């Protein structure tokens, strides 16, 4: 009579499953994106006798770090990572976090930042001077060359950190920006530290790797399994109904 | 459904991109016209399960989820690069190099 | 005891857990 | 103090190129269909969830 | 009650009517325009809430006109253009509407079979009386 | 979504190329000037680790 | 008053003015 129960959790699940894929393709165009994967998990409830009812509830792993695909814009300040490339930004809450999005921007006080958030570099946020333009070499060297100023006085004003993620350690915050997991920040400390093994390309900017071929797949294997269970309930449902009439006289 | 609610979000962003190509190539023969390009932001997760323990002398994947919530544009820049000259001959027409405006 | 048979001892809770640690 | 020059009896054109607008557009449209498509099999479940 | 599950549905089947009968509405509206008056069109909305007597049935209070900029086409040849020479064209999204449509029948469909279920279960009820 | 952007790249370049060899020949009259070419290079190569 | 009540008067009648007179 409880089958109905793990047939709906497993259609609860298959939803939830569903609504995953669905993020992942509707924003399948932001610049650095990372695809959410997920997979059904068993759990077998047991005891005393006859361990049948295992029932599911959906899981997703961190992610799949594939580089995402480049495209070129030609614009001075569009950075592109490594295969496992960072770069670290503070959050809103203080905190430092990581992204791929290269889409970089300068205020009008001379504040580099990401989409919302500021770059950090040596010590705190990186500043440039007021209106000069800015050339990011392959390492991460900040130039600026002040407009009118003949071309013979480019300056390095700074330099972005960079850290290097493999990828089964960090996960997805509440608001996009991957942070390290708890054994692995306790054992590489809180706060990484930069490496010169990564390099960036100038002009070229990142976009995000969601399969198609994988979201469609998932979304017939989804149908199916939800149409099935379906099928289980009503099945089960009127089973019972007819059975409840045995207390009858 | 946050499905439905999900690709509405997805189906919106798309037509206002389209919308921005569209205005891009109406004005291809506009004097002095700078190029847009939109950029989106995805909207701030979900948590439901926080993940359990790990590498406890086992090598199971990660137990925690999170849905999303869907895409939004968030920004549409201009890029203020340098376009070509055409040449008209005529005596009041002025062409700026570098980066100024007319007040 | 066999199934559907009468004991004198209550069954011990069910747990279903996630992922033992 | 970096202001730029002038030409006189020159205008300076759009800077738009058509092959980023054409690559987009084929990007666009066949993210479009793809959203429908999902949201196609979502309206199916809940179609064949209804008619429990 | 007992008997208030076929006031809920029934005002539940009543919203849902009404807010699909909004939504065909703007979609017939979509590209019209200089109403009565004179006056633009502008798209519509409802609000749901719910019917604290605890747990309550849903209803609408009013239909809220969209805040949405409307579209402004350059079209000096109308007579409702401005003094630059623009017309004020409603705000109809397109999706939006289709999945409005879309919730509005699964909704309704999910609260006929709640009450299918519910009419049997109350007929099966009376055979005690006897 | 995976060959699109690298032919958009590709004409890009190609697009680059036509513009100088157009520079080269807009002044092939005027006294002084230096002929330009273009030198090419392609982007990072991801890797795909065997198991 | 709300939609669906008893009222002891009818509505007024409806009508769709194509352009206000």
């Known amino acids: ?249 | ?103 | 005891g066999v199934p559907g048979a009468l004991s004198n001892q209550p069954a011990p809770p069910n747990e279903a857990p996630i992922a033992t640690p | 103090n970096g202001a730029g020059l002038l030409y006189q009896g020159y205008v300076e054109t759009s800077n738009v190129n058509v092959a980023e607008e054409l690559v987009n557009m084929i990007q666009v449209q066949r993210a479009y269909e793809i959203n429908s498509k999902a949201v196609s099999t979502t309206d199916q479940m809940l179609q064949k969830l209804t008619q429990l | 009650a007992l008997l208030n599950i076929f006031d809920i549905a029934g005002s539940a089947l009543a919203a849902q009517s009404k807010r699909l009968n909004v939504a065909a509405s703007n979609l017939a509206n979509a590209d019209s325009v200089t109403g009565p008056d004179g006056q633009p069109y502008r798209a519509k909305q409802v609000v749901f809430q719910v019917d604290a007597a605890a747990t309550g049935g849903v209803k609408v209070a009013s239909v809220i006109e969209s805040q949405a900029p409307e579209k402004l086409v350059y079209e000096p040849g109308n007579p409702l253009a401005d003094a630059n020479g623009y017309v004020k064209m409603p705000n109809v999204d397109v999706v939006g509407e289709m999945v409005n449509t879309m919730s509005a029948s699964r909704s309704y469909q999910a609260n006929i079979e709640v009450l299918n279920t519910v009419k049997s279960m109350m007929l099966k009820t009376l055979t005690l009386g006897q």
């Open chain 2, 1 to 103: 459904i946050s499905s439905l609610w999900i690709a509405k979000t997805g189906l919106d962003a798309q037509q206002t991109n389209m919308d921005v190509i569209a205005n891009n190539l109406a004005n291809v023969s506009t004097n002095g016209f700078k190029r847009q390009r939109a950029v989106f932001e995805d909207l701030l997760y979900q948590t439901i399960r926080q993940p359990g323990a790990q590498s406890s002398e086992q090598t199971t994947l990660p137990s925690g989820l999170q849905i999303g919530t869907g895409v939004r544009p968030v920004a549409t820049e201009r890029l203020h690069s340098q376009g070509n000259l055409s040449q008209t001959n005529n005596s009041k027409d002025v062409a700026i190099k570098g980066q100024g405006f007319f007040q």
């Open chain 1, 1 to 249: 009579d409880h089958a109905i129960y793990t047939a709906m959790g497993a259609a609860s699940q298959t939803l939830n499953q569903q609504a995953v894929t669905a993020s992942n393709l509707a924003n399948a165009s932001t610049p650095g994106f990372r695809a959410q994967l997920n997979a059904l998990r068993a759990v077998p409830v047991d005891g005393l006798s006859l361990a049948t009812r295992t029932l599911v509830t959906a899981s997703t792993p961190g992610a799949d770090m594939t580089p995402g695909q480049l495209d070129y814009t030609s614009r001075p300040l569009d950075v592109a990572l490594q295969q496992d490339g960072w770069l670290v930004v503070q959050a809103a809450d203080g905190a430092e976090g990581y992204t791929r999005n290269g889409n970089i921007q300068v205020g009008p006080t001379g504040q580099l930042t990401i989409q919302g958030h500021p770059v950090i570099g040596e010590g705190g946020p990186i500043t440039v001077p007021e209106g000069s333009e800015i050339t990011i070499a392959a390492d991460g060297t900040i130039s600026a060359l002040n407009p009118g100023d003949p071309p013979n006085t480019v300056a390095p004003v700074g330099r972005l950190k960079l850290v290097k993620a493999e990828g089964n350690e960090v996960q997805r915050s509440d608001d996009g920006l991957f942070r390290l997991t708890a054994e692995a920040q306790a054992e590489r400390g809180a706060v990484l530290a930069a490496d010169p093994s990564i390099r960036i390309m100038s002009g070229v900017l990142e976009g995000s790797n969601v399969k198609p071929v994988e979201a469609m797949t998932d979304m017939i294997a989804n149908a199916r399994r939800f149409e099935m269970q379906m099928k289980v309930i009503t099945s089960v449902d009127e089973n019972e109904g007819r059975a409840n009439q045995l207390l009858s006289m």
